[PDB]
Amino acid sequence: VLKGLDAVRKRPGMYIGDTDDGTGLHHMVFEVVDNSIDEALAGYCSEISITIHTDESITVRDNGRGIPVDIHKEEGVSAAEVIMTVLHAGGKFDDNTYKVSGGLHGVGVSVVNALSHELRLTIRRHNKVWEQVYHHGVPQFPLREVGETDGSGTEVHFKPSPETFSNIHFSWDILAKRIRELSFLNSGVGILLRDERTGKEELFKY
Ligand SMILES: Cc1[nH]c(C(=O)Nc2nc3c(N4CCOCC4)cc(C(=O)O)cc3s2)c(Cl)c1Cl
Ligand SMILES: [Ca+2]
Ligand SMILES: [Ca+2]
């Protein structure tokens, strides 16, 4: 019986949705972006960028508070690592978790992490820069300090795993349609979509 991220990599459809028709693939982006939008709603984030790279990887960057980096007392690793590597169980008995189709809503970034062959996390918090890298959800090394900064926020770069997803090709139109909606709802945040494949860029703002 598989638990945790093992369960996710075994049956990714139960979490992210269909892994062949583009549903799950675009859900990966929105699961990351929704965490930034959480920062916007809380009044800490005014800037989100979403970049599609020429290798069909994604970079989401926000100017929110930065994922917490303190050592977690119970796990003995950074809070950020716990958030990245533990399947969140708080939603399991909430109505809003379960979709008619397309997997789960609010699955968490740890599911994005599990289904990415590489995920690079860069946090600006407490005037330091912190970085962690993962592969298929497994940390390569503990979160570590790599510099100083005068700002704060979170950057996630992820490469969808071809062993989970087929037809790995992001759609500007699918992303823009949701981003329009999020921009409408969250008027204090500007959301930049950047497509390095086509050279196209657009800033979405209420
Ligand atoms: C691109 C991107 N951005 C983020 C991102 O900013 N997440 C953040 N989460 C929190 C946070 N948690 C605590 C645990 O319950 C959920 C909220 C607390 C604090 C704080 O108390 O200071 C701040 C933050 S910032 C994520 Cl995740 C991703 Cl992916
Ligand atoms: Ca959420
Ligand atoms: Ca900030």
PDB file of N, CA, C and O in Angstrom, residues 19-20 36 38 40 42 44 61 64 86-87 93 96 110 120 124 128 146 151 167 177:
ATOM      1  N   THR A  19      -3.220  12.991 -17.731  1.00  0.00           N
ATOM      2  CA  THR A  19      -1.810  13.274 -17.962  1.00  0.00           C
ATOM      3  C   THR A  19      -1.446  13.253 -19.448  1.00  0.00           C
ATOM      4  O   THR A  19      -0.277  13.474 -19.770  1.00  0.00           O
ATOM      5  N   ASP A  20      -2.426  13.050 -20.346  1.00  0.00           N
ATOM      6  CA  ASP A  20      -2.194  12.947 -21.784  1.00  0.00           C
ATOM      7  C   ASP A  20      -2.909  14.043 -22.577  1.00  0.00           C
ATOM      8  O   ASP A  20      -2.489  14.350 -23.697  1.00  0.00           O
ATOM      9  N   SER A  36       0.747  31.652  -5.026  1.00  0.00           N
ATOM     10  CA  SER A  36       1.077  33.069  -5.148  1.00  0.00           C
ATOM     11  C   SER A  36      -0.181  33.920  -4.956  1.00  0.00           C
ATOM     12  O   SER A  36      -0.162  35.007  -4.345  1.00  0.00           O
ATOM     13  N   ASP A  38      -2.685  33.193  -3.193  1.00  0.00           N
ATOM     14  CA  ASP A  38      -2.948  33.206  -1.758  1.00  0.00           C
ATOM     15  C   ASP A  38      -2.234  34.398  -1.100  1.00  0.00           C
ATOM     16  O   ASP A  38      -2.787  35.088  -0.230  1.00  0.00           O
ATOM     17  N   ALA A  40      -1.444  37.123  -2.630  1.00  0.00           N
ATOM     18  CA  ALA A  40      -2.105  38.332  -3.109  1.00  0.00           C
ATOM     19  C   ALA A  40      -3.340  38.633  -2.263  1.00  0.00           C
ATOM     20  O   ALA A  40      -3.568  39.777  -1.859  1.00  0.00           O
ATOM     21  N   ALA A  42      -3.960  37.727   0.725  1.00  0.00           N
ATOM     22  CA  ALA A  42      -3.544  38.059   2.084  1.00  0.00           C
ATOM     23  C   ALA A  42      -2.933  39.475   2.138  1.00  0.00           C
ATOM     24  O   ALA A  42      -2.652  39.984   3.216  1.00  0.00           O
ATOM     25  N   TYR A  44       0.015  40.523   0.460  1.00  0.00           N
ATOM     26  CA  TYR A  44       1.470  40.533   0.485  1.00  0.00           C
ATOM     27  C   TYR A  44       2.085  40.477  -0.909  1.00  0.00           C
ATOM     28  O   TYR A  44       3.285  40.670  -1.032  1.00  0.00           O
ATOM     29  N   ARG A  61       7.163  33.125 -10.498  1.00  0.00           N
ATOM     30  CA  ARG A  61       7.831  33.953  -9.514  1.00  0.00           C
ATOM     31  C   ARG A  61       6.850  34.950  -8.926  1.00  0.00           C
ATOM     32  O   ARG A  61       6.131  35.612  -9.673  1.00  0.00           O
ATOM     33  N   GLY A  64       5.560  37.810  -2.910  1.00  0.00           N
ATOM     34  CA  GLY A  64       4.951  37.639  -1.594  1.00  0.00           C
ATOM     35  C   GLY A  64       5.992  37.471  -0.489  1.00  0.00           C
ATOM     36  O   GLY A  64       7.081  38.014  -0.542  1.00  0.00           O
ATOM     37  N   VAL A  86       5.560  16.904   1.456  1.00  0.00           N
ATOM     38  CA  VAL A  86       4.545  16.174   2.188  1.00  0.00           C
ATOM     39  C   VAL A  86       3.214  16.466   1.535  1.00  0.00           C
ATOM     40  O   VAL A  86       2.843  17.612   1.330  1.00  0.00           O
ATOM     41  N   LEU A  87       2.487  15.401   1.221  1.00  0.00           N
ATOM     42  CA  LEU A  87       1.159  15.561   0.660  1.00  0.00           C
ATOM     43  C   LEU A  87       0.235  16.155   1.734  1.00  0.00           C
ATOM     44  O   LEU A  87       0.080  15.580   2.805  1.00  0.00           O
ATOM     45  N   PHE A  93     -11.067  15.878   3.729  1.00  0.00           N
ATOM     46  CA  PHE A  93     -12.466  15.758   4.074  1.00  0.00           C
ATOM     47  C   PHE A  93     -13.196  17.077   3.854  1.00  0.00           C
ATOM     48  O   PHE A  93     -14.255  17.292   4.428  1.00  0.00           O
ATOM     49  N   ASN A  96     -14.492  21.020  -1.219  1.00  0.00           N
ATOM     50  CA  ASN A  96     -13.910  21.754  -2.334  1.00  0.00           C
ATOM     51  C   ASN A  96     -12.677  21.053  -2.925  1.00  0.00           C
ATOM     52  O   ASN A  96     -12.137  21.528  -3.929  1.00  0.00           O
ATOM     53  N   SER A 110       3.340  20.109  -3.510  1.00  0.00           N
ATOM     54  CA  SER A 110       4.087  18.871  -3.358  1.00  0.00           C
ATOM     55  C   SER A 110       3.746  17.863  -4.467  1.00  0.00           C
ATOM     56  O   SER A 110       4.589  17.057  -4.876  1.00  0.00           O
ATOM     57  N   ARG A 120      13.195  23.551  -8.983  1.00  0.00           N
ATOM     58  CA  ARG A 120      14.172  24.444  -8.383  1.00  0.00           C
ATOM     59  C   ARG A 120      13.401  25.502  -7.598  1.00  0.00           C
ATOM     60  O   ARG A 120      12.598  26.231  -8.182  1.00  0.00           O
ATOM     61  N   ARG A 124      13.230  34.248  -1.279  1.00  0.00           N
ATOM     62  CA  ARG A 124      13.745  35.467  -0.687  1.00  0.00           C
ATOM     63  C   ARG A 124      12.904  35.747   0.552  1.00  0.00           C
ATOM     64  O   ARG A 124      11.700  36.013   0.432  1.00  0.00           O
ATOM     65  N   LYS A 128      17.494  37.115   3.105  1.00  0.00           N
ATOM     66  CA  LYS A 128      18.367  36.095   2.552  1.00  0.00           C
ATOM     67  C   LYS A 128      17.722  35.410   1.362  1.00  0.00           C
ATOM     68  O   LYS A 128      16.516  35.321   1.253  1.00  0.00           O
ATOM     69  N   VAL A 146      22.094  31.144  -0.006  1.00  0.00           N
ATOM     70  CA  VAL A 146      22.981  31.339  -1.139  1.00  0.00           C
ATOM     71  C   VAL A 146      23.213  32.815  -1.442  1.00  0.00           C
ATOM     72  O   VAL A 146      23.833  33.127  -2.450  1.00  0.00           O
ATOM     73  N   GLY A 151      14.489  42.152  -0.903  1.00  0.00           N
ATOM     74  CA  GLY A 151      13.083  41.903  -1.168  1.00  0.00           C
ATOM     75  C   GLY A 151      12.660  40.531  -0.645  1.00  0.00           C
ATOM     76  O   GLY A 151      13.406  39.849   0.045  1.00  0.00           O
ATOM     77  N   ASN A 167       2.639  14.313 -24.415  1.00  0.00           N
ATOM     78  CA  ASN A 167       2.172  15.495 -25.132  1.00  0.00           C
ATOM     79  C   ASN A 167       2.499  16.773 -24.354  1.00  0.00           C
ATOM     80  O   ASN A 167       1.608  17.607 -24.139  1.00  0.00           O
ATOM     81  N   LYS A 177      -6.413  32.257 -20.296  1.00  0.00           N
ATOM     82  CA  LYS A 177      -7.834  32.317 -19.992  1.00  0.00           C
ATOM     83  C   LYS A 177      -8.012  32.329 -18.474  1.00  0.00           C
ATOM     84  O   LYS A 177      -8.774  33.144 -17.953  1.00  0.00           O
TER      85      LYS A 177
END
